[PDB]
Structure 1
Amino acid sequence: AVQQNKPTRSKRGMRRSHDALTAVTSLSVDKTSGEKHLRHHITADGYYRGRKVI
């Protein structure tokens, strides 16, 4: 099965109206280190909820 007519650039755009990415709503800030991190994840420096976890 294949198209009988070439779909338009308009229709292409309409299909892609649901493809946009969502940015992270907000980053969390570790209480101790002050590092921004993804919520419920450890920081880059290995803190989580103030404690040096790794």
Structure 2
Amino acid sequence: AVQQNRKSRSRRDMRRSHDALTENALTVDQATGETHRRHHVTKDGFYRGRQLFA
């Protein structure tokens, strides 16, 4: 139910050794030069040479 000894700072860091984040997959769109998330629409509404909300 609870620890019998306080965990040392070294073991705590060794547990967090798997906590790192990853970057996302970003691509530069060619029809706008923009950078967007891959397979995602841009915030301007562009995706693969197609426009939403002109």
Short-chain TM bin: 0.7 to 0.9
Hey, which bits of structure 1, 4+ residues long, moved more than 3 A? Answer: none
Report the TM-score when normalising by structure 2: 0.85
What's 2:43 paired with? Answer: 44
Report the TM-score when normalising by structure 1: 0.85
What's 1:14 paired with? Answer: 14
Structure 2: which 5+ residue stretches go unaligned? none
Percent identity over the alignment is 62
**Matched residues in 2 for 1:21 and 1:45: separation?**
27
Letter in 1 for 2:42: T
Highest RCO, 1 vs 2 (Cα 8 Å, sep ≥ 6):
1
RMSD of equivalent CA atoms: 1.2
